[PDB]
Amino acid sequence: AVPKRRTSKTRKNKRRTHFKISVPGMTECPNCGEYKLSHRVCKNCGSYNG
Amino acid sequence: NHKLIEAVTKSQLRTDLPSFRPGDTLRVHVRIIEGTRERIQVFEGVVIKRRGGGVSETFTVRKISSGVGVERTFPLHTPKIEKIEVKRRGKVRRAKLYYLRSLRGKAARIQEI
């Protein structure tokens, strides 16, 4: 089927309300100091210690 | 195998009936509660299958009466099978003897052990 009527740019931005993407869910490494991704291995420096 | 299911349903299990194998020839002494009395109408024949476990253990006997083969399914632990007597132990090389449901004559023979 075809759209019978173009979408007003208010309805477009209403539909795009939930199209946001979420944070990565990250923590501070207790060895690296830099940030890691929880339950993952520190890309920056070394081990996982779990 | 759940211990509670078993703990409930393990008085229902009969205790003295023998252990045969699916391919043996049996005679089952069933009871007939119709009318105003019982009889013991023996059902003979080959043991086509045993199936399942627990209180829900069934077996099937098969006999060719007169040009027509009848199969009867009995739960093991029914109190109606008064006894079971084993004539001859057959040699089958498998569990379910379903090929015998399509053999008709001297092809549906089983050896003896």
Binding site: - | V30, E34, T58, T60, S65, S66, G67, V68, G69, V70, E71, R72, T73, F74, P75, T78, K80, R101
Partner: protein
């Protein structure tokens, strides 16, 4: 059994094979079981028997390849379907019966069949 099932009449009534037309009992019933009266037409016959082919008669289902449950976990399964050609009374039309018949036919009034049956 199904309104097209070709049954083996195991009754010495001239008819040999019959075709089911209707399963009596109920508006829209579609399956008969051992001890159920079916209307059927004769498709084959023996020369010189009262039931000549091309006629509509009544029968009862005596054997079945699916069987009965028998109310206490006991199953019976015959090897081939079969029916007895029967009259408007619950009594056979022939004089002999061939092969086993089921005991749940006695609960009906087909006592003349089991009386004539070679075994139950």
């Amino acid at each position: 059994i199904q309104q097209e099932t070709r049954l083996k009449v195991a009754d010495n009534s001239g008819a040999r094979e019959v075709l089911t037309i209707k399963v009596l009992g109920g508006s829209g019933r579609k399956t008969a079981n051992i001890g159920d009266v079916i209307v059927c037409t004769v498709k084959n016959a023996t020369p010189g028997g009262v039931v000549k082919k091309g006629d509509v008669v009544k029968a009862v289902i005596v054997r079945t390849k699916s069987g009965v449950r028998r109310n206490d976990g006991s199953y019976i399964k015959f090897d081939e379907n079969a029916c007895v050609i029967i009259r408007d009374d619950k009594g056979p039309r022939g004089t002999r019966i061939f092969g086993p018949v089921a005991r749940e036919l006695r609960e009906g009034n087909f006592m003349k069949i089991v009386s004539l049956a070679p075994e139950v």
